[PDB]
Design a protein around this ligand. Structure first.
Ligand SMILES: *[C@@H]1O[C@H](CO)[C@@H](O[C@@H]2O[C@H](CO)[C@@H](O[C@@H]3O[C@H](CO[C@@H]4O[C@H](CO)[C@@H](O)[C@H](O)[C@@H]4O)[C@@H](O)[C@H](O[C@H]4O[C@H](CO)[C@@H](O)[C@H](O)[C@@H]4O)[C@@H]3O)[C@H](O)[C@H]2NC(C)=O)[C@H](O)[C@H]1NC(C)=O
Ligand SMILES: *[C@@H]1O[C@H](CO)[C@@H](O[C@@H]2O[C@H](CO)[C@@H](O[C@@H]3O[C@H](CO)[C@@H](O)[C@H](O)[C@@H]3O)[C@H](O)[C@H]2NC(C)=O)[C@H](O)[C@H]1NC(C)=O
Ligand SMILES: *[C@@H]1O[C@H](CO)[C@@H](O[C@@H]2O[C@H](CO)[C@@H](O)[C@H](O)[C@H]2NC(C)=O)[C@H](O)[C@H]1NC(C)=O
Ligand SMILES: *[C@H]1O[C@H](CO)[C@@H](O[C@@H]2O[C@H](CO)[C@@H](O)[C@H](O)[C@H]2NC(C)=O)[C@H](O)[C@H]1NC(C)=O
Ligand SMILES: *[C@@H]1O[C@H](CO)[C@@H](O)[C@H](O)[C@H]1NC(C)=O
Ligand SMILES: *[C@@H]1O[C@H](CO)[C@@H](O)[C@H](O)[C@H]1NC(C)=O
Ligand SMILES: *[C@@H]1O[C@H](CO)[C@@H](O)[C@H](O)[C@H]1NC(C)=O
Ligand SMILES: [Ca+2]
Ligand SMILES: [Ca+2]
Ligand SMILES: [Ca+2]
Ligand SMILES: [Ca+2]
Ligand SMILES: [Ca+2]
Ligand SMILES: [Ca+2]
Ligand SMILES: [Ca+2]
Ligand SMILES: [Mg+2]
Lengths: 697, 939
């Protein structure tokens, strides 16, 4: 019967299309009067309108470029499809999918941003033979490898350097019996070269300097190595790695006012022909936001190589910089190589899309579908991948009213990857009949008939539905006892023509429906994340609820465990709600009295090794339990650092095993390979044999 | 909100001189308030940038400033073997130009000092200075607090203790009304920072001309120790003074440390002896919390509140994960010495890299409303990235989250408009405090002269109903009787220093909704629906009331008898004449609307006599103190009499509760129209009910109100509920006073499990067994005096099959088990439990436990191998037991339960030994024996 389309718009095709995506307009002039022109398409077919007259716009995502995803990196395509055309109706939605795939053998670019303060003089003696040892351990993951070098200390200004005695301006270590190099801010040394014999032959020439205050000017270099891409040597089709080794806190913006410099960092390239930051002593430090923006634009991955003193500070920093990874570095970089390799492994085991240049009228909600088919609503990222794994997200796009401009473009892309999907949105807010509309005068009014589509819209300031009556007609209320037009309108010529309000415009057949009466959080209706659609908030695709609070994004309810609110709870409204008894914490990461790890998850020596039991027909045998089966033989540690347990296996043989943790977490087995290990039925057998022998006798 | 932006006074300065880095007012002896504008890098005598101070007087046009002369000549003396030097070059003289009643205290934060004894040196460091000037001849007294004469070897050998070399002791400065001068110094004590104070009279009388190193007699310096949280915190980046303790004579400082505790930041409140009273940490890392503080009393309660800026705050956006807007925090002073709560209001910027809140300046009362206002600046904000200054107005609950005015930057890009602000001092004797902003990019100062405020108060007294049957007036120029009715409009205007020739336009609209040819009410005089008569209220403090007369048209002209007749009024200032420049700013209830309606079905009286009967009930009666309780109220309103014109429901909400939603019981509008009115002494919500109710109209309301936290509410809260109507006779219902009694609770949930839980054992320390009875306090409020009484098995003796060791709690426990555990020390189911085995009454006690708090009791163990070694073929089972209670709780009444419950943490032990049973896996061996025997028989 009655629907949303019939009770709002019959006057114009444009408003009928705009009311709801499920409506459609028939412009057949042979349709007898008295039938709803705007209704459902199925009802329109039941209405016996002309199928040619029916115009039902359909929102669709026409794939334009669909080059297959490349398998190796020897062109390489990692996001498919790479170009989509959308035609969204007013307040409509339509989904599409990206197929991200990390491709092996992808070329790798390495830039080494080493600090050169006096506290890091011991460090220069360990990097003296990197590169070649980086080449030998990167040839197992990449064929095309290029490396580069950099340096930084701090700003050459009075509160940070020594400017007295006069001989200490060229040797800031005058008091001690050393010859340090003059203080500098950035002295980029090597361009990215495929050859690896220069990273070895140029670090044999650097020296150290000496500032005064412990923090070092680190953020001045992550702004000039990122931006001056024509001198760094960044390739357009490689993996960009920015290794950042430091030994102390770092100066951020507004720290320069202690020296006089008060000019904000513009963020452009200031490295000249001498390979030096020329504007170091005249421009401030860059804030975090500028660094994140410039790193994101140039597709650069930043790897921290900090020490134990400052690892907490830099770990707490890296949460604000997407696409980064911290790593505990020794006091003399004895473990920089393995740190780089493991950071490369960790950055390639996560796919995180980032919409760029998103129109103000569009909202995007995702639904990750990673290894196996575990769809996790809300999340637009996932971990646990290896090099070669394909992921398939599922994006939802909604437009809040047809915008004025009808061609916009954004670009969903995984971080650190040149490849991206470019969306060509084409909003459709047009109707066929009103396009070919001419003034058919004398149809209504005194020679003032309006355009086609069966409506002679009377001129403003003139009274009359079809220009019929000015002052002196039918009932204009749903009920006889109810007030006419719900007291917010006037019923002239038998049609509720209603007021104009500064708050908004009143809509409806009787316009008893309001467009600004929706609930509000603080100052604005629908919490600022939705539009008031006839008294009921229609929140964006990202948000849901009665109010438009309660986001559906589950990025907040995410932990390193890899499950929503861990495996002991559930997430609602962007917050982690603890369900398991005794559980608490920021994201339900703390449920104590609970049965230990070496209590329940022991069937991995039953489903995986010596396969038996459940998870034999259910594809979750190894998704959760992925412990590495290692067989040590009776260390003198019969339970100090972990929880060894024993159960009688399928053959009732006691198996003393141990699995828990060795250093902050270890899915590593410490199991020994070699384990250590009835009258009635007996009598009944005995008797029969006795009788069986009895027959023999 | 008046800051007039059309006509500005621009003070210019030399090219290349930043001229606006810092500002301050100076009130001389003979009035005549001038402007002191600091100007760093303003060249100097020998073509080197040493800054300068310009004493600009006040003039309408604005121009180049005279300049105040300070000595800049690189002084040098030889006290002894010392060679005390000061280097006046690249000093920001003018970076802070604070003033007193007669003294100008312009400071140079970057001035060098270098004593030279033989070959050893004390090294050039930016000590700073503060040149004290005085008009009326005056003297060039200088006050550098931390000018030292200690060599470098002493500092290095003492591990940099009391290292006042890098004070930069001009960075911030305020002069207390007593006469003291406290100077910030972020780099003092090796970049921890300090605060140095000396009386103005003492430094004036202690100066000797040419004397460089002299110690003021009555000075003091803040102390700083080796707390690692304080390292490189720049404590002293911005200072302020206020009154917080309550003792007026005593004075208390406010100091910001933008990089306190690893780039987190903080703001501390001190005492005149440099003793901490509080500390407010930032919300986000690298947000620069405390870059600029400002002490003002926004909410008009007599206690000085606080505002702290975080220019580099990063927020979350749609397509940007983290976006750099900026934030400002407002802290309201609580009654008594109570701890400062959460930030009462959070103001965030909108433009990327806007650095919102990098300069906060109290503004006095711009509107003269009794609530002090503030101005917050975004140097690089605005749509074009040029600059902006936002004015916020204080109110009872604090500030307003919406900026009341936005001032754009007349200067081009890169001007840093709004970098420094000042206010709360009248400059033109207009009675209104003004505001002077600075833009060191363009080397100019913009003076915004606040315009007078006119507070307009408008009413409209009209009859509640019009009867067209009665005819008491006639139409002009004719003898046609009409049904006239009276209109009474009163327009008021009260203001401080308003022009004596004030004019206003009063626009009257009758039957506003209906069209021009459909109007029902017509003015008698002009016979036009809408009129406008000028108001000449100049010099009239009391509101002036004017009355007119309107009538109802003929019956045949209109066909509606139910739609209400709506009248509206609008008082607006006349438009500016040739020259623009509006005289005053109008603010208040500039427009009002009133409704009227023709009489209908009111019976013989011709007035619709209402009979309102309101009955109310409240569900969810138990209110919890300090909890976000939600109250659902059900009221049934039914009118027994004639029509209730503009019926309405009045809920007298307390200052804590807040209106959240509604729901009717008759389709129509289950969600009901409710507006909260704050004009009353308390908060009263205005939930609509219907205009009008018919006879015997019964309407049910579902009223859900979120009751806020009210500590002073008391044992019970009375809710005042009433029905409000505009009728002449009996316009209200019976007042229903709903007393809501208020009460408390503690809910600890205990569990336990062993490590491991299940255990197969064998056929100097054994395995541990933990009964982790954790005090998971689900109770609403804090608890104090929580004492437990547990009964464990075994008396901790060598004879049992276990060795119950010590425990690891979290707080002040001291149960000595009976008898004590670790009598030594160390580091079939046989049920070893209290019921079967001996019992040990273990009693450990705790005191506090805020809502949600927890902690517990962890049992460490190592099993006694021999004792249990008994029962050669039995597999033992270990059981525990536990009890607990409460002595008291810090509540009015904790009348629910002294927490009690029993659990049993089991450690099941199994026997992994077994023999050989099923006649199966040897039942081919028997047959083989049989075959051997058969073959033997055959042979
Ligand atoms: C980056 O890394 C983390 C991310 O937050 C943080 O590192 C932290 O260090 C700070 C300072 O040391 C910690 O703040 C303080 O934590 C205290 C411990 O938290 C609880 O302690 C009780 C027992 O004391 C336990 O029972 C609880 O389970 C918690 O572990 C906490 O007591 C303390 O309270 C203080 O702050 C509050 C205001 O929030 C004051 O009211 C109170 O008076 C007191 O001053 C602090 O919260 C922080 O907790 C640490 N992180 C965690 C979660 O452990 C820092 O953000 C960054 N680290 C660095 C190096 O900067
Ligand atoms: C991401 O995943 C969530 C997981 O539920 C999806 O939300 C739900 O999607 C299902 C499938 O469409 C909805 O079920 C269907 O709902 C429609 C009406 O909305 C109904 O006509 C169908 O018969 C069926 O019941 C389900 O309602 C919906 N959940 C809610 C509350 O919205 C979500 O759609 C997925 N989004 C993307 C980006 O694919
Ligand atoms: C888009 O979302 C729909 C709903 O989940 C997916 O399901 C199919 O959608 C297509 C057209 O969108 C229909 O023709 C199929 O019949 C739908 N099948 C199901 C299971 O409902 C669809 O796979 C998603 N992908 C795209 C791009 O359409
Ligand atoms: C989003 O915020 C709104 C407030 O604008 C929350 O309102 C809730 O209202 C319900 C009514 O049943 C209460 O029970 C809730 O306690 C209220 N808030 C809370 C704490 O949830 C709304 O619930 C919020 N969304 C969330 C956080 O779920
Ligand atoms: C100097 O003054 C001129 C006008 O005299 C102005 O245009 C220019 O921008 C100023 N700045 C400098 C240092 O040139
Ligand atoms: C100092 O403060 C105390 C507390 O109010 C007051 O009693 C005393 O008179 C004050 N002393 C003076 C003279 O200011
Ligand atoms: C009153 O006049 C002002 C000035 O234009 C206008 O903005 C406001 O909407 C008017 N109010 C009414 C009810 O006319
Ligand atoms: Ca080192
Ligand atoms: Ca440094
Ligand atoms: Ca005091
Ligand atoms: Ca206050
Ligand atoms: Ca005010
Ligand atoms: Ca003034
Ligand atoms: Ca009557
Ligand atoms: Mg260092």
């Amino acid at each position: 019967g009655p629907n949303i389309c019939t009770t709002r718009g019959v006057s114009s095709c444009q408003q009928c299309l705009a009311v709801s995506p499920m409506c459609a307009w028939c412009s057949d002039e042979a349709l007898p009067l008295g039938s709803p022109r705007c209704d459902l398409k199925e009802n329109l077919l039941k209405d016996n309108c002309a199928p040619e007259s029916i115009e039902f716009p359909v929102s669709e995502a026409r794939v334009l470029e669909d080059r297959p995803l490349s398998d190796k990196g020897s062109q390489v395509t990692q996001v498919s499809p790479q170009r989509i055309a959308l035609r969204l109706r007013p307040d409509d939605s339509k989904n599409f999918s990206i197929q991200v795939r990390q491709v092996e053998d992808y070329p790798v670019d390495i830039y080494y941003l080493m600090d050169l303060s006096y506290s890091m003089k011991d460090d220069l003696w360990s990097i003296q033979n990197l590169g070649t040892k980086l080449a030998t351990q990167m040839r197992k993951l990449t064929s095309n490898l290029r490396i580069g070098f950099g340096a930084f200390v701090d700003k050459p200004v009075s509160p940070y350097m020594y400017i007295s005695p006069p001989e200490a301006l060229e040797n800031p270590c005058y008091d001690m019996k050393t010859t340090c190099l003059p203080m500098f801010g950035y002295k980029h040394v090597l361009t990215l070269t495929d050859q690896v014999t220069r990273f070895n032959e140029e670090v044999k020439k650097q020296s150290v300097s000496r500032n005064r205050d412990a923090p070092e000017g680190g953020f001045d270099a992550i702004m000039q190595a990122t931006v001056c891409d024509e001198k760094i040597g960044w390739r357009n089709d490689a993996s960009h790695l920015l290794v950042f080794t430091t030994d102390a806190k770092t100066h951020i913006a507004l720290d320069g006012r202690l020296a006089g410099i008060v000019q904000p960092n513009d963020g452009q390239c200031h490295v000249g022909s001498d390979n030096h930051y020329s504007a170091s002593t005249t421009m401030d430090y860059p804030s975090l936001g500028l660094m994140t923006e410039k790193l994101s634009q140039k597709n650069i991955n930043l790897i921290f190589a900090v020490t134990e003193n400052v690892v907490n500070l830099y770990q707490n920093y890296s949460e604000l910089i997407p696409g980064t990874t911290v790593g505990v570095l020794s006091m003399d970089s004895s473990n920089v190589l393995q740190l780089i390799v493991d950071a490369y492994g960790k950055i390639r085991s996560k796919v995180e899309l980032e919409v760029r240049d998103l129109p103000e009228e569009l909202s995007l909600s995702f639904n990750a579908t990673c290894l196996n088919n575990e769809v996790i609503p809300g999340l637009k990222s996932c971990m646990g991948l290896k090099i070669g794994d394909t992921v398939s997200f599922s994006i939802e796009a909604k437009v809040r009213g047809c915008p004025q401009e009808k061609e916009k473009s954004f670009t969903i892309k995984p971080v650190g990857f040149k490849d991206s999907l470019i969306v060509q949105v084409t909003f459709d807010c047009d109707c066929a009949c009103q396009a070919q509309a001419e003034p058919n005068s004398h149809r209504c009014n005194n020679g003032n008939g309006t355009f086609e589509c069966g409506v002679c819209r009377c001129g403003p300031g003139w009274l009359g539905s079809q220009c019929e009556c000015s002052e002196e007609q039918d009932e204009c209320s749903p009920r006889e006892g109810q007030p006419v037009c719900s007291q917010r309108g006037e019923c002239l010529c038998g049609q509720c023509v209603c007021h104009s309000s500064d708050f908004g415009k009143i809509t409806g057949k009787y316009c008893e429906c309001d467009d600004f009466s929706c609930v509000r959080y603080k100052g604005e209706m629908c919490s600022g994340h939705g539009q008031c659609s006839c008294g009921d908030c229609l929140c964006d695709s990202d948000w849901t609820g009665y109010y438009c609070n309660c986001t559906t994004r589950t990025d907040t309810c995410m932990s390193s465990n890899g499950l929503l609110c861990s495996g002991r709870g559930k997430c609602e409204c962007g917050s982690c709600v603890c369900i398991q008894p005794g559980s608490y914490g920021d994201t339900c990461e703390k449920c104590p009295t609970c049965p230990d790890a070496c209590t329940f998850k022991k069937e991995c020596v039953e489903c995986k090794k010596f396969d038996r039991g459940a998870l034999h027909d259910e594809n979750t045998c190894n998704r959760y339990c992925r412990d590495e089966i290692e067989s040590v033989k009776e260390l003198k540690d019969t339970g100090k650092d972990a929880v060894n347990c024993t159960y009688k296996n399928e053959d009732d043989c006691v198996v003393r095993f141990q699995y828990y943790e060795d250093s902050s977490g270890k899915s590593i087995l410490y199991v020994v390979e070699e384990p250590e290990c009835i009258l009635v039925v007996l009598l009944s057998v005995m008797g029969a044999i006795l009788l069986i022998g009895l027959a023999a006798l | 909100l008046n800051l007039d932006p059309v006509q500005l006074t621009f003070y210019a300065g030399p090219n290349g001189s930043q001229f606006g880095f810092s500002l301050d007012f100076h009130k001389d002896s003979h009035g005549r308030v001038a402007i002191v504008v600091g100007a760093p890098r303003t060249l100097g005598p020998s073509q080197e940038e040493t800054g300068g101070v310009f004493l600009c007087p006040w003039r309408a046009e604005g121009g180049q400033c005279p300049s105040l002369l300070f000595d800049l000549r690189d002084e040098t003396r030889n006290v002894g073997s010392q060679t005390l030097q000061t280097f006046k070059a690249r000093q920001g003289l003018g970076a802070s130009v604070v003033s007193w009643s007669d003294v100008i205290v312009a400071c140079a934060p970057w001035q060098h000092w270098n004593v030279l004894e033989k070959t050893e040196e004390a090294e050039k460091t930016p000590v700073g200075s503060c040149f004290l000037a005085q008009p009326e001849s005056g003297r060039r007294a200088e006050y550098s607090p931390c000018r030292g004469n200690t060599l470098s070897r002493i500092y290095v050998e003492n591990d940099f203790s009391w290292d006042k070399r890098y004070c930069e002791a001009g960075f911030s400065s305020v002069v207390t009304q007593a006469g003291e001068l406290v100077l910030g110094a972020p780099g003092g004590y090796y970049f921890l920072g300090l605060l140095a104070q000396a009386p103005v009279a003492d430094i004036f009388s202690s100066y000797r001309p040419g004397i460089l190193l002299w110690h003021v007699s009555s000075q003091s310096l803040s102390f700083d120790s080796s707390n690692p949280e304080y390292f490189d915190g720049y404590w002293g980046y911005s200072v302020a003074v206020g009154e917080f303790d309550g003792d007026l004579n005593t004075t208390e400082y406010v100091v910001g440390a933008p990089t306190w505790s690893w780039t987190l930041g903080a703001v501390e409140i001190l005492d005149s002896y440099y003793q901490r009273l509080h500390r407010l940490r930032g919300e986000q890392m690298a947000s620069y919390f405390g870059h600029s503080v400002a002490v003002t009393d926004v909410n008009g309660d007599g206690r000085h509140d606080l505002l702290v800026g975080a220019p580099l705050y990063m927020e979350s956006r749609a397509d940007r994960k983290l976006a750099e807007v900026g934030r400002v925090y407002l802290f309201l002073q609580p009654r008594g010495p109570h701890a400062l709560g959460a930030p009462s209001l959070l103001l965030t910027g909108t433009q990327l890299y806007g650095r919102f809140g990098s300069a906060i300046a109290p503004l006095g009362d711009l509107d003269r409303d009794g609530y002090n206002d503030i101005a917050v600046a975004a140097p690089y904000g605005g749509p074009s990235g040029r600059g902006q200054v936002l004015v916020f107005l204080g109110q009872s609950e604090g500030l307003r989250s919406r900026p009341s005015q936005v001032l754009d930057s007349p200067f081009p890009t890169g001007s840093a408009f709004g970098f420094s602000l000042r206010g709360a001092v009248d400059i033109d004797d207009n009675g209104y405090p003004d505001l002077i902003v600075g833009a060191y990019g363009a080397n100019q100062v913009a003076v915004y002269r606040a315009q007078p405020v006119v507070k307009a108060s408008v009413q409209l007294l009209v009859q509640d109903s019009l009867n067209p049957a009665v005819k008491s007036c006639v139409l002009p120029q004719t003898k046609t009787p009409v049904s006239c009715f009276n209109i009474q409009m009163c327009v008021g205007a009260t203001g401080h220093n308003i022009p004596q020739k004030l004019s206003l336009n009063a626009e009257l609209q009758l039957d506003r909704q209906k069209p021009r040819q459909g109007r029902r009410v017509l003015l008698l005089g002009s016979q036009q629906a809408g009129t406008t008569l000028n108001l000449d209220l100049g010099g009239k403090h009391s509101p002036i009331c004017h009355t007119t007369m309107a009538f109802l048209r003929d019956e045949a002209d209109f066909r509606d008898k139910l739609s209400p007749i709506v009248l509206s009024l609008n008082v607006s200032l006349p438009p500016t004449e040739a020259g623009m420049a509006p005289a005053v700013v109008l603010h208040g209830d500039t427009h009002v609307q009133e409704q009227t309606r023709i009489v209908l079905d009111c019976g013989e009286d011709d007035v619709c006599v209402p009979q309102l009967q309101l009955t109310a009930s409240v569900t969810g009666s138990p209110l919890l103190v300090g909890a976000d309780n939600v109250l659902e109220l059900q009221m049934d309103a039914a009118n027994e009499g004639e029509g209730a014109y503009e019926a309405e429901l009045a809920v007298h909400l307390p200052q804590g509760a807040h209106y959240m939603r509604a729901l009717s019981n008759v389709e129509g509008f289950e969600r009901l129209i409710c507006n909260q009115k704050k004009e009353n002494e308390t908060r009263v919500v205005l939930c609509e009910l219907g205009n009008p109710m018919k006879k015997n109209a019964q309407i049910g309301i579902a009223m859900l109100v979120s009751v806020g936290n009210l500590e002073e509410a008391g044992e019970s809260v009375s809710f005042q509920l009433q029905i409000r109507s505009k009728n002449s006779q009996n316009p209200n219902s019976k007042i229903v006073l709903l007393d809501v009694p208020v009460r408390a609770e503690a809910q600890v949930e205990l569990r336990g499990n062993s490590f491991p839980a299940s255990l197969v054992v064998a056929a100097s320390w054994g395995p541990k067994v933990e009964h982790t009875y954790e005090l998971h306090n689900n109770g609403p409020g804090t608890v104090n005096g929580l004492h437990l009484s547990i009964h464990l098995p075994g008396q901790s003796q060598p004879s049992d099959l276990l060795y119950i060791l010590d425990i690891q709690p979290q707080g002040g426990l001291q149960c000595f088990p009976q008898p004590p555990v670790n009598p030594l020390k160390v580091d079939d189911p046989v049920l070893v439990s209290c019921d079967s085995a001996p019992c040990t009454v273990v009693q450990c006690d705790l005191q506090e436990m805020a809502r949600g708090q927890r902690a517990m009791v962890t049992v460490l163990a190592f099993l006694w191998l021999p004792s249990l070694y008994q029962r050669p073929l039995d597999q033992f089972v270990l059981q525990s037991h536990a009890w607990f209670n409460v002595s008291s709780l810090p509540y009015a009444v904790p009348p629910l339960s002294l927490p009690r419950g029993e659990a049993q943490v089991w450690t099941q032990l199994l026997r992994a030994l077994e023999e050989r049973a099923i006649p199966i896996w040897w039942v081919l061996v028997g047959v083989l024996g049989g075959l051997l025997l058969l073959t033997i028989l055959v042979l």
